[PDB]
Ligand binder design. Structure first.
Ligand code: SPH
Ligand code: SPH
Lengths: 287, 246, 51, 240, 49, 240, 148, 48, 51, 48
């Protein structure tokens, strides 16, 4: 009472179960009404349509729109990692850890990077074979070591007691292991691009190795062993396939045309930039 | 009733006689953080008219060889006005922006500028090194240019390794010297967390690029600047402490 | 269409957890107007954009 | 227990199969969601956005001048300017468009494309052009008397700086597979040519040439099917 | 074993270990020679009717 | 019988999986329950109990004097006394608290902490202190003019012998992972410092120094997620 | 000095905003905290050449391995059920197709004296027969304490 | 889980057996049908 | 939330014994006041503890 | 950069040929005496 100055989105949603129909349109002879002329300086795309440009027939369109949703586009398993467990003769560790980063393999990386923010679940399958290829009847242990948890120091070391860490016991002759994983980010979404630094302080101008590394993506480590006492002589790879499910996506961004170099960095060649479209002989020959 | 606009924010205001609509990024307005999304318990501060208002950077001059410039937000504003002070004494920042770009010339000039807004805009090292040890990275003065802005080494791939032609996915507009002399975009707060540190993290960069180069026939004006004026709509600050510039 | 009395069951879950389940329930929702035409003043297709 | 009889498909791992798997963390409640601007649902929303066709994609186009279409005052009237094939999932000027990347993860497409041209001249530059579209058939039209026979739109340079040539879906099939030719060249969509309607006419004291910028998008009719893996990417060794 | 479907326009694998086997999109079947034979259902994929 | 098709996940043993197993003893009825005092249901009940922060955890602190904070009459006013990081799942004075052990079985935490100080002096000892909390940022405050800028509470020695500095949750994320720094130092919570507000003033004939005892706990807001195995324990061989 | 913890709260110490808090509390219950399998024991069966017993007994004490021991010892009294899994491998590691017998010998019951000895007739003692190539054995066990 | 007992006929592949198999393409909608003249239903129409 | 018509079944038991089953039915019950504040005379947060 | 901090108005040359900078009353007193400075310079209004 004594001091008065103290006292939405335009876009909406619509279900689309099939491709758009086409209504019939005849010609137009008159002034003042001009569907063709656009001005792109407003950042908005041309709203001109089939039916105001030419004369059209009527098309009932039963083409399905369904397969292109982000759920169906992103729910497929593809390789996020490869782990090499020697365990054999000579120098023998007896186990191998793999930090969980799905940016290590390009084919599934470029699909994710269409988007800035993502919130999903996961389905991991572990396909393990021997050096060339085979399956023998050896028991395996796949253990998840979340951030802050002790990493195992040896084949038999006590960190494999896994009274808490989830683990999978499986034989090489069994069908590949599989589990469901939740959304574990301490933020509200995963983000594949973080423009910023994780901590305060003075940042070197010569080499910034901390630029662009989001803390919220550090999920812990995956570790393998052969359950045993002495050692085996075999040598095996485990391939790791991640499926995305229940996925949501935000803020689409352009698709990367340059060859990747590093996992965690978008470094590209200042020399050698490859053109996004192949070159022809002349602009006047379509072919 | 279209090409003439006035924008009034705080004690500042902007008029333009030549304008192409206004872009509202992703169809939302800036807003204060709702009680359901918030996490930090302490009470944020809301200065309103002292922070939210138009700040005007220096002008970038416009040449035939120019490859284009970029800025980072809030970073450009962290040293200026009362907005720069609040962001130093608080650990938690949230707000949107209203971006306005002025470039004018005369009916005998020509060119076009792409103005975009890129959420989480990550610059990229330039080199053939595939080892994360020997591989180059950009410097802090590059990643976060400040008021002085930065420039593109490779404007075609946007320095991030991504084609410029697809930049039209971001909220954008063009300055086409035959059509409009300004471009205005109103950006909501975008981030994966409700609040963040204005110092460590920049939400989005701004980009001005010559897709079509400046041309003028001799005798006309050679000096064309590009001025930038940005206002922080709907600001909040939390986690009050001592002052940290970086 | 068709498929008279096919008695489909998929979404039935065997675990006490929601993320154990299988996609989707789909979604048919679209909002292209936020990416394609994100402008304050609405522009009709008949009228010229700039007047 | 319950007598069972196992079938082929046992022990196979199909990447696209929809099944339940065991949770690792019983009782896990994830971090609350918040509102984030710019959510996407389907990728067809992203195919309706205009991005820049690279028509000058030829050699000696330097780096960023590949996106520009030079227009100047001609001498012989009725001249061709630029031409590109309509196939959005085919190597060419569509290879730089967003709609060109997404139709390249799928085996087939159907719908109406759209091609927007923006002329960046001086205010004093005037001109008319003819943007023509010819369905499949004899090769690229030789003349504008041949190119006027197709779908065309005349465009006057002026206050409104863009025209759009809509490319209606004209096909025998419901879909078109995106692939190279000699066999799959059955599915070629057509040819866009851009001709001088009159001329690029400019007063004295003004630059003697300008640039058109071309963009491309889709209409509400456009769809896709049979998702696959793109050809643009190549990897050799595990990224370190 | 790996049985992968490479639809028209998709890159064909160039080697045993080549990257086209990452199959982030292409459907694939992983199976042991000692497992019962693989089996899948396929739709009507013709671009005509 | 019923045709079945087996899936990946067959024959795997997942430690956290929820399944039925066969009973060994059919018809077994266990020994009747009785009422026992002190039942626990969740571990968050145990995290709300104050246990003793070991602030003097430094070297040459002997055995049990590690839990005490020496307070005496200063000379230069405005002096620092003790400081510790707020991260309860981090190496330091929180490593001896019950809430420090339980947040160390989990990958993440969220909530408000609480720090209780109890001054054991003589009845005749008076004084004031400043218990300040500074959110993440520049390092430990250098002055009390810098430390007053944060969250602080002034405390007068008197009849009631304890004050509590509540440490509100101030974060960009909903959770904070508990781990070491250099990268995860993104999640550091802040710094508690304890300054002389005025001075420790004591009459004649009374001891010239005393000890504060600090304790720590959680508020109703505190939670945890992603249970894992602790780092404090080490085993070598099977215990005989 | 009253042994009671400070009841002071966020809201009376400073000025606060309103926070609707949807963080889940569920994962920290004693059910979810303690329901995980972890190693309670290891049994070495030679059966090989030279000196050969042909069997090995393991007295059931789950205090033998520290990692699961420290979780239990947070509490003085516990009443629970159990799920035991038996993962058997060979010396280095492998699975051959040999048949096994896992027998439970409750207090007072005769312990087997030999590989073939009669106490393996198990007309009463519960036993599990399993091949090394089979997925690991598993059973549910009740609360067997004669106290409460 | 549910105790089961496997029977003879396990792992056999019978060419004429009627079973469900896994789809390769989730969310696939085929190209619309059209009317085509001369549809056949049974082969006895062709024997007449 | 969400999960419309997911038809969840877990607690169904295949044996005649109660301990054969699977956890939990959960529990949301808490009583922190017995461990945290186990004092005869109740003390408010406003008042000073000792008077 | 110092002058943008005050009350300002940006003005584009064009069809409408005039802009107006309104100078709001910002004062500690209700009135300002009009006189020279050194003492009465207390009442100075500001700078355009
Ligand atoms: C029994 C073994 C289970 C293994 C469970 C591992 C789950 C880990 C969570 C995966 C979620 C996606 C991974 C995070 C995203 C990217 O990798 C980030 N760039 C990491 O830096
Ligand atoms: C077919 C083989 C089944 C094996 C069944 C064994 C069940 C034994 C009951 C286990 C209950 C927990 C064990 C007792 C607690 C600690 O070990 C005590 N400290 C023992 O001294």
């Amino acid at each position: 009472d004594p001091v008065e100055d103290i006292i939405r989105a335009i876009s909406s949603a619509t279900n689309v179960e099939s491709a758009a129909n086409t209504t019939p349109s005849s010609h137009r002879l008159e002034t003042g009404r001009v569907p063709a002329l656009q001005a792109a300086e407003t950042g908005a795309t041309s709203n001109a349509t089939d039916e105001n440009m030419i004369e059209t027939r009527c098309v009932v369109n039963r083409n399905g729109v369904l397969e292109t949703t982000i759920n169906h586009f992103f729910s497929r398993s593809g390789l996020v990692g490869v782990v090499n467990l020697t365990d054999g003769g000579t120098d023998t560790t007896g186990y191998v850890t793999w930090d969980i980063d799905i940016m290590g393999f390009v084919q599934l990386r470029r699909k994710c990077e269409m988007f800035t923010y993502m919130r999903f679940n996961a389905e991991f399958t572990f396909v393990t074979t021997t050096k060339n290829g085979e399956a023998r009847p050896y028991m395996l242990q796949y253990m998840y070591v979340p951030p802050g948890a002790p990493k195992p120091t040896g084949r038999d070391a006590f960190q494999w007691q896994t009274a808490t860490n989830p683990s999978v016991f499986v034989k090489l002759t069994d069908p590949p292991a599989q589990v469901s994983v939740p959304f574990m980010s301490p933020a509200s979404a995963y983000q594949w691009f973080y423009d910023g630094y994780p901590t305060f302080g003075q940042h070197p101008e010569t080499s910034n190795t901390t630029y662009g590394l989001c803390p919220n993506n550090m999920m812990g480590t995956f570790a393998v062993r052969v359950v045993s006492r002495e050692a085996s002589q075999l040598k095996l790879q485990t391939r790791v396939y991640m499926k995305l499910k229940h996925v949501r996506a935000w803020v689409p961004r352009p698709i990367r045309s340059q060859p990747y170099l590093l996992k965690n960095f978008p470094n590209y060649d200042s020399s050698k930039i490859t053109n996004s479209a192949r070159d022809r002989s002349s602009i006047k020959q379509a072919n | 009733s279209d090409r003439v606009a006035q924008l009034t924010v705080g004690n500042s205001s902007i008029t333009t006689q030549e304008a192409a609509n206004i872009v509202l990024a992703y169809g939302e307005w800036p807003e204060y953080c709702p009680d359901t999304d918030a996490t930090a318990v302490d009470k944020p501060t809301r200065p309103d008219v002292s922070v939210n208002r138009f700040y005007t950077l220096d002008s970038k001059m416009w040449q035939e060889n120019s490859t284009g410039w970029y800025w980072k937000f809030p970073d450009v504003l962290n040293k200026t006005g009362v907005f720069g002070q609040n962001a130093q004494f608080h650990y938690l920042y949230r707000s949107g922006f209203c971006l306005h770009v002025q470039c004018n010339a005369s009916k005998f000039h020509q060119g076009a500028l792409l103005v975009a807004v890129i959420p989480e805009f990550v610059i990229a090292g330039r080199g053939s090194n595939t080892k994360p040890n020997e591989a180059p990275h950009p410097g802090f003065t590059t990643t976060f240019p400040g008021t002085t802005g930065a420039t593109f080494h490779d404007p075609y791939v946007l320095d991030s390794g991504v084609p410029l032609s697809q930049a039209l996915i971001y909220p954008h507009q063009w300055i086409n010297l035959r059509t409009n002399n300004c471009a205005t975009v109103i950006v909501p707060y975008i981030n994966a967390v409700p609040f963040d540190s204005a110092i460590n993290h920049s939400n989005f960069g701004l980009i001005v690029i010559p897709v079509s180069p400046l041309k003028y026939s001799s005798g006309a004006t050679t000096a064309i600047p590009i001025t930038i004026t940005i206002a922080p709509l709907n600001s909040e600050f939390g986690g009050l402490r001592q002052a940290v510039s970086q | 269409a068709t498929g008279g009395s096919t008695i489909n069951f998929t979404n039935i879950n065997y675990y006490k957890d929601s993320y154990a389940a299988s996609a989707t329930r789909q979604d048919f929702t679209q909002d292209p107007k936020k990416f394609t035409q994100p402008v304050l003043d609405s522009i009709r297709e008949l009228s010229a954009p700039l007047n | 227990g319950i007598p069972a009889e196992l079938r082929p498909g046992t022990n196979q791992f199909l990447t696209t199969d929809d099944d339940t798997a065991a949770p690792i963390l019983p009782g896990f409640t994830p971090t609350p969601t918040i509102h984030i601007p710019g959510e996407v649902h389907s990728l067809l929303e992203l195919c309706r956005v205009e991005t820049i066709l690279e028509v000058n994609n030829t050699t000696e186009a330097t780096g960023l001048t590949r996106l520009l279409i030079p227009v100047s005052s001609q001498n012989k009237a009725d001249e061709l300017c630029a031409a590109f094939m309509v196939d959005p999932g085919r190597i060419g000027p569509w290879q730089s468009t967003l709609v060109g990347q997404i139709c390249r993860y799928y085996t087939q497409w159907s719908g109406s494309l759209k091609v927007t041209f923006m002329f960046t001249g001086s205010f004093m530059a005037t001109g008319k052009m003819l943007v023509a579209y010819s369905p499949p058939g004899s090769a690229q039209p030789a003349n504008r008397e041949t190119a006027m026979l197709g779908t065309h739109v005349i465009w006057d340079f002026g206050l409104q700086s863009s025209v759009s040539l809509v490319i209606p879906w004209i096909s025998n099939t419901h879909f078109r597979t995106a692939k190279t030719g000699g066999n799959y060249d059955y599915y070629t969509a057509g040819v866009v040519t851009l001709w001088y309607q009159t001329n690029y006419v400019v007063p004295p004291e003004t630059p003697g040439e300008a640039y058109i910028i071309a963009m491309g998008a889709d209409l509400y009719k456009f769809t896709l099917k049979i998702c696959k893996d793109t050809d643009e990417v190549t990897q050799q060794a595990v990224l370190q």
